[PDB]
From Swiss-Prot, chain A:
This is Nuclear pore complex protein Nup107. GO terms for cellular component: cytosol; kinetochore; membrane; nuclear envelope; nuclear membrane; nuclear periphery; nuclear pore; nuclear pore outer ring. It is linked to Nephrotic syndrome 11: A form of nephrotic syndrome, a renal disease clinically characterized by severe proteinuria, resulting in complications such as hypoalbuminemia, hyperlipidemia and edema. Kidney biopsies show non-specific histologic changes such as focal segmental glomerulosclerosis and diffuse mesangial proliferation. Some affected individuals have an inherited steroid-resistant form and progress to end-stage renal failure. NPHS11 is an autosomal recessive, steroid-resistant and progressive form with onset in the first decade of life. Keywords: Acetylation, Centromere, Chromosome, Disease variant, Epilepsy, Intellectual disability, Kinetochore, Membrane, Methylation, mRNA transport, Nuclear pore complex, Nucleus, Phosphoprotein, Protein transport, Translocation, Transport. It comes from Homo sapiens. The chain holds residues 254 to 505 of 925 of the full protein. It comes from the Eukaryota. GO terms for biological process: female gonad development; mRNA export from nucleus; nephron development; nuclear pore complex assembly; nucleocytoplasmic transport; post-transcriptional tethering of RNA polymerase II gene DNA at nuclear periphery; protein import into nucleus. Changing residue 88 to H: In ODG6; uncertain significance.
UniProtKB/Swiss-Prot annotation, chain B:
The lineage of its organism: Eukaryota, Metazoa, Chordata, Craniata, Vertebrata. This is Nuclear pore complex protein Nup96. The modification Phosphoserine is found at residue 47. It comes from Homo sapiens (Human). Coiled coil: none annotated.
Amino acid sequence: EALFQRDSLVRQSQLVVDWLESIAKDEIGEFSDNIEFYAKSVYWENTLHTPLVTELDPDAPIRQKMPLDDLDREDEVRLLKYLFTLIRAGMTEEAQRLCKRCGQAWRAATLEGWKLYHDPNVNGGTELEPVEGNPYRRIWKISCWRMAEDELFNRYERAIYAALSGNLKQLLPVCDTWEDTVWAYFRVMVDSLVEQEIQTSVATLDETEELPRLGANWTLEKVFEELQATDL
Amino acid sequence: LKELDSQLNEPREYIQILERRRAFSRWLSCTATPQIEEEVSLTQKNSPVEAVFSYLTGKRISEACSLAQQSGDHRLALLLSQFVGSQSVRELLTMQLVDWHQLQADSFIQDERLRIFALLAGKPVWQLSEKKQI
């Protein structure tokens, strides 16, 4: 909150993100409720119909080999694409509600961990009701980056995880537009700037960085050159 | 115990009570080191996660953090550094234990990490029905 008051670059860069998220929201329209899935009642209904999954958690597919059905994989891909579209439009609450209604408790918990820890008794500026957020922001970002880099998952889910952690993608970047690419670059630059500020202010721990992150942040000329090389 | 430089509030005793506790902890660590020096050699050839738990019992925070950081782990070294005995993390450890005890099946974690996670909640053999240290 103090950064966004003090720093005009961070604040104006977020206004560009909010603007690009508003465009993507206008394009989605009222159509969020007409998504017909083959599953009506339970996650991976067809795979469950065909017992072969020893664990109901999402780590079983990454631990074992092939153990899901085609209908379950299609439903998971559709859910990941819907979550990515919601995150690009700027409806985090709507995406969390959709995940909770579908039954993706792990996905909802991973998406709700994007906000940092803010205590109302310690921080006297933004005094609210209860303490929300996680204190291991760097650890959560490293875990999200590792999950996005790991294979044996959905192409849309990996891209959404990479965008939430602060990186780019390759499978979902082929059909991305110039505005979406610019918004992703601005979000990555804002995340890199926030990480650099947290590292310089001695906010995060020295052992919280499990994996190596890109400390170099792009500038206005770099973003312009990237947008040019993307869509002259 | 007697303090050297006097403070403003002389009605209570906060510096002497801390000095006595520090002296008692230093004496207990020196008394337990003769029985902890032999157990650290046999645990290094079995599981590397027990070294931090064995070194944390001798009032060694930095020595445990360095061993946790120089062994592949990263979250354990950042979690063991906040062993001051305050709140915040006390309820967070209990919440994490309650979430790992159910929800996502049973979550079979390591035996050495569970004790280190439960010791940061202010009660290792009291407020921990699942990961009891008894």
